[PDB]
């Protein structure tokens, strides 16, 4: 009673836009490093596009009189071929930066590029997380940390999950690559917030009096 060759337009008009989002994630990550970039989202309103950003300090990306933002809007439109002025943008601010892995790991990358030793950077990150109210943070720094023969030394503090579906909700992970004279220094972070949002971790029972 129905034709399957027509709804393929609706289905293929969702896929393309999901992909368009990922290129933006990559571009922002390569661009708004200094603005505490974290993530992105999109809303394909027919008249115009809207994009919502999550940044520690938006005023940096906002730019005096909204210049950087506007310079960006005209740019994306040419690439995705939309009429500019229909490619507007909005920015939102993260308040719990310690619960965000991306902010932490990027800060760590900065601190590392200034030559400070790993032992201080990691534990400063971890203190920052715990102050934010977290049940664990693990840091790892693999590579040619010494003369040769690269090794991984990992730092941790609290308790962490490692398996199960719950690791896709309460466990936030991220990684980066740091290019240096000796070579490449792999770094990755993971944080555990069990009381996140409103969801309740299973196998967790509370009783009454």
């Amino acid at each position: 009673i129905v034709r399957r060759d027509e709804e393929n337009v609706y289905y293929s008009k969702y896929l393309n836009d999901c992909i368009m989002e990922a290129e933006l994630h990559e571009f922002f990550s390569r661009e708004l490093v200094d603005a505490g970039y974290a993530s992105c989202s999109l809303c394909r309103t027919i008249d115009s596009i809207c994009v919502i950003i999550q940044c520690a300090e938006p005023e940096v990306v906002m730019g005096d009189n909204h210049y950087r933002l506007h310079k960006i809007e005209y740019l994306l439109a040419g690439r995705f071929m939309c009429d500019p002025k229909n490619f507007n943008i909005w920015v939102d601010k993260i308040i719990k930066r310690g619960l965000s892995a991306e902010i932490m790991v990027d800060n760590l990358r900065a601190k590392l590029e200034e030559a400070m030793p790993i032992r201080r950077a990691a534990y400063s990150i971890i203190r920052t997380a715990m102050r934010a109210g977290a049940a664990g943070c693990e840091v790892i720094v693999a590579g040619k940390l010494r003369a040769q023969r690269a090794r991984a030394n990992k730092f941790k503090e609290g308790c962490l999950i490692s398996t199960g579906h719950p690791k896709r909700i309460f466990l936030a992970e991220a990684t980066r690559h740091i290019k240096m004279r000796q070579g490449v220094i792999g770094v990755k972070v993971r944080i555990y917030n069990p009381n996140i949002r409103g969801a309740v971790m299973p196998d967790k029972i509370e009783i009454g009096a």
């Binding site: 571009f27 390569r30 506007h70 310079k71 005209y74 740019l75 994306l76 690439r79």
Partner: protein, 105 residues
């Protein structure tokens, strides 16, 4: 290698009026569908990837723009030095500003 001046002016104007240029990573023969120039050529003529790519290489070398490559796309943005340079090739007068500063929102 031998680029017409119409093309130069076209690229610069596109930059100023859009403060940007997102360009493909391509080296085969083709015509850019965005920036167009008229040199008695039909209604308008579109350029070729080769000329524009050489132009952009030079500009970024001089410090005018700053690249931010991605999913095999070139993303350029003009800076302040670049503005202080584009403003005279086009013969623009002082004080004039590009469109994105014109309160798009």
């Amino acid at each position: 290698v031998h680029i017409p001046k119409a093309v130069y002016k076209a690229v610069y104007a596109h930059l100023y009026e859009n403060a940007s240029l997102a360009l493909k990573e391509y080296w085969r023969v083709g015509n850019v569908p965005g920036i167009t120039y008229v040199d008695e050529n039909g209604k308008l003529c579109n350029p070729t990837y080769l000329h524009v790519n050489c132009i952009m290489q030079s500009l970024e070398s001089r410090g005018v723009v700053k690249d931010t490559f991605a999913w095999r796309h070139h993303y350029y943005l003009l800076t302040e030095k670049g503005e202080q340079f584009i403003r005279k090739e086009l013969d623009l007068t002082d004080d004039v500003l590009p469109t994105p500063y014109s309160k798009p929102s």
